[PDB]
Design a protein around this ligand. Structure first.
Ligand SMILES: Nc1ncnc2c1ncn2[C@@H]1O[C@H](COP(=O)(O)OP(=O)(O)OP(=O)(O)O)[C@@H](O)[C@H]1O
Ligand SMILES: Nc1ncnc2c1ncn2[C@@H]1O[C@H](COP(=O)(O)OP(=O)(O)OP(=O)(O)O)[C@@H](O)[C@H]1O
Ligand SMILES: Nc1ncnc2c1ncn2[C@@H]1O[C@H](COP(=O)(O)OP(=O)(O)OP(=O)(O)O)[C@@H](O)[C@H]1O
Ligand SMILES: [Mg+2]
Ligand SMILES: [Mg+2]
Ligand SMILES: [Mg+2]
Lengths: 434, 457, 409
């Protein structure tokens, strides 16, 4: 159907955010936040005024989305008065940040109407000789600025802030970080050159703020499909009634997640899976597909992995949990887990379960380790940065030299939690009380 | 190149005069940042105030006369000395030295003192700590050598070269704490040259602490700097008053020609007079001096207060960017309240129930054991313990079906979103551990401000 | 969304989720897509059949497990992207770049920007899917490695005709929960049960078992009939090894090939129509897993004395010669080992023959020490400890007629 194909594509483009600048969706609770950001952008490109503001907000709090909308609004009228210089804190390191500024400057100057030539010392020398009828606003977009605010030295943070007060070239720095206390991460001299302009991103307070945001993301305000007038009546009917299924999923996510991009991960596959207009109105009223998405997200955790185990995989995890529970530090190995499993088979058959030999439990023991159930005692695991990951690979741990039957392991789930996720129909329920 | 200055000539007497060479002592990126304007920048009555308050000497009398007298007795007398400048970051340390060099440059043109060369070397504006030798050799000699060739060239030049074919060099050692290395070879070489007879080098070191050579440097480098040190005292409350009044001397208590059509103001159509209350300047300079006495902080407070007043003035009229405007004390007090406030308290009050339950469960475990180190397995057991308190009541079981089953019969009873959210916000901490039960959880923020957010819900 | 959804066995929800994200239009396609799922869940099977039925999508496959370190990973991305774009549009003259020049995360953005600038002659926007089958399977893995790939599309120009698409296939669960605050549409893959595992192995092994060389040579020495025979052996293997293997596909596929020639030779002219007599004739192939497929006298006694010094306190040694085995062994000294070894030895001084057998005992990794690489035997601070289990040390003492169980009773 050509009518449903135009409505399905328009509804999906609104949730992802690929709409043009002339048809962007602005929420109600975010309207008072983009006005302050627009004031700084309009004052540095038009009025040519140096500014410095570092945004502070949680993850997926519409930080980069608001900055991308301000750059697209100014490009539709003032596209020859400023440039776009983007920076990252995770990709660009300390030495790579110097070459990243000179690289983004030679490609933006040739587009309006070298710098990144030589060694690392000659590159930084040409940058200070350039930044430090009208001028050109050098808009700096810094992402994850908390990584560059190291307590050892902040070289880039000291030179970037110097291009605002002393320098005459209008440089607009828009830092984006997640730390709430970004003022303490700076040095004594770095914080002196900053204007102390920390704009905190607002969050969802009441329940009506999330309803207006979802309604504005699924309402087609353009005449591009004959099913537009029929879809707006169905969406407004389910949202205005608090006893519907759409209002229940919003209230549940408001007290558990309270995030707009998180809830948008389930509305996108709900519309794309609809074959026609009749299937779209049915899934939006009963919300049958939303319950399937919630079960899949909690299917590979500690609860969903227990249902995919056999009778031997459950008996080993139960017998190994009783050893660490009765111990002082919870240390156990393969020899301690085999003693509890062997005493359980002879006790049940005395009141026929095939007793496996010690040569067969080795395959079951290694299968539970890969399934995230038995963690090594006093083990770091995944390192933070790449520095500690290289030093840990060259050092041979003590657990690799000792055999597998003498390796100290730890239980990822205590016996108190196993009794709640096991029904009464199983025969291994009597050995989970101790 | 790699050839030092010692192998450039044959002998010592064979070196010609360096002052008559069109290459010693200094003998293209400003055109690409220009564009044509196709509009008109509408400047309101508050635009001229913000531009004059920017960082681009009535409160410094004894400090300006001490640095000028130390250099006047060495340049004319053809000697070498070392001036130490220490103070709070933002008291006019670099600006005082810049005014001394600018005053000495005007006296050199009057045929009074010999000509000198001003070299500005910043420690924080360099990538490598050994890059300061290449910058000094390029400004004095004019060549481009490496860090190893420039170090040996400066020693041979500041010793064997006589004074009849030399020239005074004034080097400003900006950010002295940035050039501090482990071997302490760069800091010692920059101070040992001033103790030579045939040197004629003026070194003006600028740091941030008076006890810097007594803590980082040793007894050898401290004996070469000098016992006399100039301490830059921070600005008080009576010195910051004339600083703001000097930048807005011709703008305060003056009439403007603000247009009612666009909003353009012309400094001498309505006759709008701009006046700033004197009480707002006294209440702002006193708070700045009571914190650190930063010179840039006193200018940023009046600039932020004028920006807030300009936002309400443009919104109430509907101007754009393209009777008497009086800045009261409300704009100044609001400019200082946005910084001294703590957004950590209001951040936890707007979180969801799952995020608020994790904070309430962590604080309850601290009042039972008192160890400031609760594991991840104890928080999960404490959360489930609070749910089963009144399980028989219908009012409490309504939330158990969502936190453990999400309102679905097919979803089993659960045992990550709110955990990683508080970690990136700088509130909660978590050690590097592969286990999810014995992993200790510590609080980064205070404990007094965390309990106030739980009681507000 | 115009795409074809294939039919996958027991993957109706997983196939519908891939069609809702992967599309030919970048405006309705997310920049990140994680396919979390453990081994034996069918992550690669549901992705190959989805891209084979639709030939309009251009996907790039990459295996990070074959690059060990993270440095060759950045070089393999720019090398596979340029090679894929070369054969896609051969009528466009592009410039070949060196993939070995990508040594930093910043250099990857400059290399990808120098390629997309010469591909602006197209009409519509063509997606570029970069499937990373096994992202968490990389060796030198850290918590900051995934943060550099989820923000790659931000540095890329928005006005580009070719947009990259990252697809990750994780394996564990804790690795996915570390980035749950980024709001990434993750498609989980639950493990199959006892009803879906046997059905998958039947529709995947019947086409190679009935046409094997062993089964065709047995019917001539002693197509619907051979199908039920091969299907009965697969069902009998899963039901007999459901507890030893669990729900893994690789663990059950190896046991089938290991018992297929042994099950064909046990079939005669009477066991072809009677499945009851065939199961009784080959009872040794289902009751067990069939597994998988000279020490010196001084060397045997040295391991006995080393087991005592590593599992007993040295303060009570003056009362015997004159469960601690369930924990890690303790470290002892060289002179402390020769004292017990000389007492338990039958009717000998410490000559070079005793030290020769002790040095060879450490080469076979039978006794551990305090240093692994570059060990100093003459150092007085380096201690020695045992490194053999109790079952290994039990059979050694039984060959020399030595009572080793009475010392710990
Ligand atoms: N250019 C864009 N076009 C469309 N949507 C966008 C764009 N930039 C961001 N978004 C949307 O913004 C939402 C919220 O993430 P956003 O990038 O705004 O937050 P962030 O805090 O800057 O990011 P992160 O926490 O991952 O560092 C995402 O779900 C994404 O869909
Ligand atoms: N008397 C003054 N009147 C007005 N402004 C002043 C005065 N003295 C100093 N300043 C301001 O002080 C600012 C900082 O000066 P300077 O470069 O010397 O800093 P500093 O004391 O070395 O410390 P930092 O730069 O690390 O904050 C200058 O931009 C200048 O505008
Ligand atoms: N639903 C299914 N129907 C039929 N065959 C299947 C199904 N799921 C998986 N398979 C088969 O399982 C075999 C082995 O699984 P495969 O290695 O592809 O899975 P995976 O989950 O992608 O693996 P890994 O975790 O190692 O990346 C494949 O060759 C495929 O044919
Ligand atoms: Mg972002
Ligand atoms: Mg300074
Ligand atoms: Mg695979």
């Amino acid at each position: 159907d050509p009518g449903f194909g135009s409505l399905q594509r328009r509804l999906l483009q609104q949730l992802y955010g690929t709409l043009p600048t002339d048809e962007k969706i602005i929420f109600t609770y975010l309207q008072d936040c983009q006005q302050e950001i627009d004031r700084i952008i309009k004052q540095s490109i038009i009025q040519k005024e140096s500014h410095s503001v570092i945004l502070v907000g949680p993850r997926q709090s519409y930080k980069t989305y608001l900055l991308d909308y301000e750059l697209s609004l100014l490009q539709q009228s003032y596209k020859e008065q400023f440039i776009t210089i983007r920076l990252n804190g995770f990709i660009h390191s300390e030495q790579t940040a110097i070459n990243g500024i000179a690289t983004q400057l030679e490609q933006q100057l040739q587009k309006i109407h070298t710098i990144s030539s030589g060694s690392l010392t000659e590159v930084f020398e040409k940058i200070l000789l350039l930044l430090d009828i009208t001028k050109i606003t050098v808009v700096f977009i810094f992402d994850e600025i908390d990584t560059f605010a190291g307590p050892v030295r902040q070289t880039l943070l000291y030179n970037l802030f110097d291009m605002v007060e002393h320098s005459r070239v209008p440089v607009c720095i828009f830092g984006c970080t997640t730390k709430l206390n970004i003022l303490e991460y700076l040095e004594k001299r770095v914080k002196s050159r900053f204007s102390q302009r920390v704009i905190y991103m607002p969050q969802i307070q009441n329940l009506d703020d999330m309803v207006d945001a979802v309604r504005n993301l699924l309402t087609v305000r353009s005449e591009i499909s004959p099913w537009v007038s029929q879809w707006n009546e169905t969406l407004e009917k389910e949202l205005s009634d608090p006893r519907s299924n759409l209002n229940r999923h919003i209230r549940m996510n408001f007290e558990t997640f309270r995030s707009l991009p998180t809830l948008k991960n389930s509305i996108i596959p709900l519309v794309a899976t609809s074959k026609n207009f009749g299937s779209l109105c049915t899934a939006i009223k009963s919300c049958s597909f939303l319950d399937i998405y919630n079960k899949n997200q909690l299917s590979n955790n500690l609860t969903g992995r227990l249902q995919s185990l056999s009778d031997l995989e459950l008996a080993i995890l139960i017998s190994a949990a009783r050893v660490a529970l009765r111990a002082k530090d919870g240390s156990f190995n393969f020899n301690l887990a085999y003693a509890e499993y062997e005493k359980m088979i002879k006790a049940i058959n005395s009141r026929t379960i095939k007793l496996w030999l010690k040569k067969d439990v080795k395959n079951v023991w290694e299968n539970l380790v890969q399934l995230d159930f038995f963690t090594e005692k006093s083990a770091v695991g995944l390192r933070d940065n790449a520095t500690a990951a290289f030093y840990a690979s060259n050092y041979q741990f003590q657990g690799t030299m000792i055999p597998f039957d003498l390796r100290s392991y730890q239980m990822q789930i205590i016996l108190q939690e196993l009794r709640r996720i096991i029904p009464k129909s199983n025969m291994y329920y009597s050995w989970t009380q101790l | 190149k790699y050839t030092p200055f010692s192998k450039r000539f044959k002998s010592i007497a064979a070196i010609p005069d360096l002052t008559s060479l069109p290459e010693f002592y200094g003998n293209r990126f400003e055109n690409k940042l220009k564009t044509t304007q196709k509009h008109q920048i509408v400047e309101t009555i508050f635009s001229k105030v913000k531009k004059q308050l920017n960082s681009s000497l009535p409160a410094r009398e004894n400090e300006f006369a001490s640095i000028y007298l130390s250099a006047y007795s060495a340049i004319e007398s053809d000697s070498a000395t070392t001036i130490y400048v220490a103070g709070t970051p933002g008291v006019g340390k670099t600006l005082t030295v810049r005014e001394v060099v600018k005053e000495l440059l005007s006296s050199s043109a009057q045929r009074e003192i010999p000509d000198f060369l001003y070299v500005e070397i910043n420690g924080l504006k360099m990538v490598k700590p050994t890059d300061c030798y290449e910058t000094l050799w390029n400004k004095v000699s004019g060549e481009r050598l490496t860090w190893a060739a420039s170090m040996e060239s400066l020693e041979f030049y500041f010793k064997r070269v006589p004074k009849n074919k030399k020239k005074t060099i004034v080097v400003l050692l900006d950010e002295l704490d940035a050039m501090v290395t482990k071997s302490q070879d760069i800091m010692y070489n920059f101070f040992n040259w001033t103790t030579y007879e045939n040197a004629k080098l003026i070194v003006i070191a600028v740091a941030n602490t008076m006890d810097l050579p007594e803590r980082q440097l040793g007894n050898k480098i401290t004996s070469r700097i000098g016992f006399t040190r100039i301490m830059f005292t921070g600005y008080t409350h009576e010195e910051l008053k004339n600083i703001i009044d000097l930048r807005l001397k011709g703008l305060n208590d003056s009439f403007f020609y603000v247009d009612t059509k666009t909003g353009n103001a012309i400094l001498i159509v309505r006759k709008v007079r701009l006046r700033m209350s004197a009480d707002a300047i006294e209440i702002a300079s006193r708070k700045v001096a009571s914190v650190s006495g930063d010179a840039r902080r006193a200018l940023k407070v009046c600039k932020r207060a004028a920006e807030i007043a300009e936002k309400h003035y443009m919104a109430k009229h509907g101007y754009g960017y393209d009777g008497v405007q009086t800045v009261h004390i409300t704009h100044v007090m609001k400019a200082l309240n946005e910084t001294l406030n703590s957004h950590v308290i209001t951040f936890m009050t707007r979180l969801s129930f799952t995020a608020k339950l994790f904070i309430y469960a962590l604080l309850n475990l601290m009042k039972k054991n008192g160890s400031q180190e609760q594991e991840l397995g104890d928080i999960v057991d404490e959360i489930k313990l609070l749910i089963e308190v009144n399980g028989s009541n219908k009012f409490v079981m309504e939330i158990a079906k969502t936190l453990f089953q999400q309102g679905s019969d097919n979803i089993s009873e659960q045992l990550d979103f709110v955990l990683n959210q508080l970690l990136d916000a700088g509130i909660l901490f978590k050690q590097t551990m592969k286990n999810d039960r014995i992993c200790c959880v510590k609080l980064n923020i205070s404990v007094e401000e965390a309990k106030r957010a739980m009681n507000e819900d | 969304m115009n795409v074809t959804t294939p039919e996958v066995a027991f993957r109706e929800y997983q196939t519908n989720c891939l069609a809702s994200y992967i599309s030919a239009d970048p405006d309705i396609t997310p920049s990140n897509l994680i396919l979390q799922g453990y081994s034996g869940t069918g992550k690669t099977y549901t992705l190959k059949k989805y891209f084979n039925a639709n030939p309009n999508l251009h996907a790039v496959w990459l295996e990070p497990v074959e690059l060990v370190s993270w440095k060759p990973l950045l070089q393999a991305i720019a090398r596979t992207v340029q090679y894929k774009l070369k054969t896609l549009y051969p009528n466009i003259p592009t410039t070949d770049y060196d993939p070995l020049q990508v040594e930093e995360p910043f250099l990857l953005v400059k290399t990808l920007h120098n390629i997309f600038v010469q591909y602006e002659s197209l009409q519509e926007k063509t997606c570029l899917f970069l499937i990373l089958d096994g992202f968490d399977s990389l060796q030198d893995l850290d918590a900051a490695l995934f943060n550099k790939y989820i923000k790659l599309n931000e540095l890329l120009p928005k006005d580009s005709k070719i947009n990259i698409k990252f697809i990750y296939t994780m394996l564990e669960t804790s690795f996915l929960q570390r980035y749950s605050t980024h709001c990434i549409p993750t498609v989980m893959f639950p493990r199959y049960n006892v009803d879906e595992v046997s059905t998958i192995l039947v529709m995947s092994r019947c086409g190679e078992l009935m046409e094997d060389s062993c089964l065709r040579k047995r019917i001539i020495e002693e197509d619907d009939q051979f199908q039920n025979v091969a299907a009965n052996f697969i069902h009998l293997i899963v039901q007999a090894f459901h507890s030893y293997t669990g729900n893994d596909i690789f663990a059950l596929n190896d046991l089938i090939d290991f018992k297929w020639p042994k099950y064909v030779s046990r079939i005669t002219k009477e066991n072809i129509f009677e499945p009851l007599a065939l199961y009784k004739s080959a009872i040794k192939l289902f009751l067990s897993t069939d597994d998988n497929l000279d020490l010196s006298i001084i060397s045997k006694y040295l391991l006995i004395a080393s087991y005592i010094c590593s599992y007993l306190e040295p303060r009570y040694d003056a009362s015997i010669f004159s469960n601690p085995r369930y924990l890690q062994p303790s470290l002892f000294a060289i002179e402390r080992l020769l004292a017990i070894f000389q007492a338990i030895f039958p009717i000998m001084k410490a000559n070079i023959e005793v030290f020769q057998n002790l040095s060879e005992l450490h080469t076979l990794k039978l006794i551990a020490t305090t240093m692994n690489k570059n060990i100093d035997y003459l150092s007085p601070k380096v201690r020695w400890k045992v490194n053999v289990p109790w079952e290994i040390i039990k059979e050694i003492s039984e060959s020399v007629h030595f009572n080793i169980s009475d010392y710990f009773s």
